[PDB]
């Protein structure tokens, strides 16, 4: 109700949804009154939208003589608010200013699905930067959805490769109840089973389950302890933290190695307070290095000179808990006035996903550029072929789109509009006495695994045989070494002529 927009004029207008405010509380969810202003997921992504469009307009190589504008709306990280604002996007399209050509975001995969179900109807291509659900890969259900992030399937794939490179052929599995945990754990099960890796037993739990529940989970994990020591955890951070708290409660710290998903990448809010339990853990962290020019632009911003971000003044007065004296959006209830010495440089922390926001914006730009070159060959600008822009053709060109990203990464979409994954493998090492910190140990680039080795742990069910493998009603990795007859030769690992005698190798 009663929402402002951040707009910028241009020949082509690109929409975007960012959670500039927290989602409503359960009382005010029906009134859709959102919470406080958000800096990293909000203000910074908004300013990045604006300044990246500035840069692309100033780029002569990319869309020459074509200006890109934008309509930026507040999603509140909530599906009701997001659907509201997307209806506001297609408002003008219904009656038949400057309709929306594409949309950037939103953040949550569920909210992204809700927005996609509406955007697909009016053939509006959507490019997301943090929604990683595998559900979004089905292009019969989400035809105009594309993302510049790898799906959770890539996290499962990278963990399977990590398990391969350390001969961890028998491991336990825990995942968090929900879309993330179950989708990722199913992908892990499939990929590890195809690679000859066995699961002792798979478990599932919510982060909010009691100390009761995590104690039961840790005891059941101990049930497998002699053989399966590595616990592949496709888990959001608080599940890992609960396992660490259970390891504290039972005194079982350091009898397992946890293989964490991106839900616990280098998040200190998970290991803080229980570092000693978590030491030795290996995690996956989505690689996204900081963008320098965004800091250059953003840190210079003053509320007196920001004449295009409507939320920037409540943001400023909430950041330094002061009162902008005599300003249009001056807020009372602050007990001090804002100094001219206040700067955003003070305790600055760039958004973790900034590179992905910027790459989604560049994806939209390069798609428009390639469409322009295919429909208006001899032109430098919009010809009548792109008046108006056919969302079908824009999707067709975006699926073909391919650039070099903000950090040098070549950005590219597969037949499902999915982007390849580059994560960095972290180790939560003990850095001396009473200091614990995450350490970059490796890199996983779209299947190519490189690890800065010698930084062991054995998790196998059975040892290799000498001269055949035979299995009971149990799993393929748990075998018994049964010898063969004197006239028999080893055909293969699992299964065992006249005038000849078995060779000295028993081949």
């Amino acid at each position, epitope marked *: *109700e*009663r929402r*402002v927009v951040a707009h910028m004029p241009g020949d082509i207008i690109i929409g975007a949804l960012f959670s500039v405010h927290h989602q409503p509380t359960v009382d005010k969810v029906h009134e859709r009154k959102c919470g406080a202003v958000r800096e990293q997921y909000g203000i910074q992504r908004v300013e990045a939208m604006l300044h990246t469009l500035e840069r692309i307009n100033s780029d002569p190589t990319l869309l020459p003589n074509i200006t890109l504008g934008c309509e930026i709306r507040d999603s509140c990280w909530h599906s009701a608010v997001a659907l509201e604002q997307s209806i506001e996007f297609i408002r003008d399209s219904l009656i038949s200013k400057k309709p929306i050509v594409g949309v950037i975001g939103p953040g949550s995969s569920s909210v992204a699905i809700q927005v996609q179900n509406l955007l697909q109807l009016f053939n509006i291509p959507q490019i997301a930067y943090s929604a990683t659900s595998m559900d979004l890969s089905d292009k019969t259900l989400f035809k105009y959805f594309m993302r510049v992030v790898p799906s959770d399937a890539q996290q499962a794939r990278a963990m399977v490769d990590i398990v391969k490179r350390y001969n961890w052929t028998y491991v336990s599995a825990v995942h968090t109840e929900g879309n993330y945990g179950e989708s990722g754990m199913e992908a892990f099960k499939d990929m590890s089973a195809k690679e000859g890796i066995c699961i002792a037993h798979s478990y599932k739990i919510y982060s909010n389950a009691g100390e009761q529940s995590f104690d039961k989970l840790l005891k059941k994990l101990t049930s497998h302890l002699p053989k399966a020591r590595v616990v592949a955890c496709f888990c959001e951070g608080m599940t890992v933290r609960g396992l660490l708290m259970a390891m504290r409660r039972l005194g079982l710290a350091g009898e397992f190695l946890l293989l964490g998903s991106d839900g616990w990448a280098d998040r200190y809010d998970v290991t803080d307070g229980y570092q000693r339990e978590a030491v030795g853990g290996i995690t996956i962290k989505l690689q996204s290095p900081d963008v320098k020019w965004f800091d250059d632009y953003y840190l210079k911003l003053r509320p*007196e000179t*920001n*004449h*295009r971000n*409507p939320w920037f*003044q409540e943001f400023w007065q909430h950041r330094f808990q002061c009162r902008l*004296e*005599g*300003f*249009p*959006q*001056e*807020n*009372s209830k602050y007990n001090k006035t804002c100094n001219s010495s206040l700067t955003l440089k003070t305790h600055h922390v760039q958004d973790s996903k900034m590179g992905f926001v910027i790459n989604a914006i560049y994806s939209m730009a390069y798609g428009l550029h390639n469409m322009q070159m295919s429909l208006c060959p001899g032109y430098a600008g919009l010809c009548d072929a792109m008046k108006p822009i056919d969302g079908r053709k824009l999707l067709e060109s975006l699926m073909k789109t391919n650039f070099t990203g903000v950090s040098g990464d070549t950005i590219l979409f597969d037949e499902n509009g999915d982007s390849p994954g580059r994560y960095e493998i972290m180790n939560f090492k003990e850095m001396g006495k009473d200091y614990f910190d995450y350490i970059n140990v490796g890199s996983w680039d779209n299947g190519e695994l490189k690890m800065d080795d010698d930084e062991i742990i054995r998790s196998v069910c059975s040892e290799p045989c000498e001269k055949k493998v035979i299995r009971k009603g149990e799993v393929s990795c748990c075998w018994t070494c049964t010898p063969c007859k004197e006239n028999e030769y080893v055909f293969d690992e699992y299964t065992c002529q006249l005038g000849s005698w078995p060779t000295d190798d028993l081949t």
Partner: nanobody
Framework: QVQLVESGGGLVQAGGSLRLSCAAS????????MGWFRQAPGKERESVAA????????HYADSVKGRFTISRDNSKNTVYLQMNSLKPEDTAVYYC????????????????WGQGTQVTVSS
């Protein structure tokens, strides 16, 4: 686009009181700070009063402090200028303006203007 429409002006005997109303169109009103202006013939336009988007933060020019009070009803999308102790040197067309960004008043970036209502202060 937002529309601003003034009303309440007319002829008023000096030393009297007069209340100007500014009605806005659109549900964005609660997001705009408001300012009153006045243009007298042969004189440059001056700022009279201003109020922030939330209300509860009012600013007045030195020539009208202690006589005018600016207010706003957000449930009605209306701004109000109560003018007391009217002097003949107040006779002018009063305008209503909406601004969203800007520095300390009167240095605001006014995005929308009204048509204006005449206030004639007879002696």
């Amino acid at each position: 686009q937002v529309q601003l429409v003034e009303s309440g002006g007319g002829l008023v005997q000096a030393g009297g009181s007069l209340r100007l109303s500014c009605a806005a169109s659109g549900r964005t009103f609660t997001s705009y700070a408001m300012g009153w202006f006045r243009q007298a013939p042969g004189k440059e336009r001056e700022s009279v009063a201003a109020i922030s988007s939330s209300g509860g933060s009012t600013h007045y020019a030195d020539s009208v402090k202690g006589r005018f009070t600016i207010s706003r009803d957000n449930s009605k999308n209306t701004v109000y200028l109560q003018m007391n102790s009217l002097k003949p040197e107040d006779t002018a067309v009063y305008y209503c303006a909406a601004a969203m960004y800007g520095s300390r008043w009167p240095d605001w970036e006014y995005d929308y203007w009204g048509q204006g209502t005449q206030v004639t202060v007879s002696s």
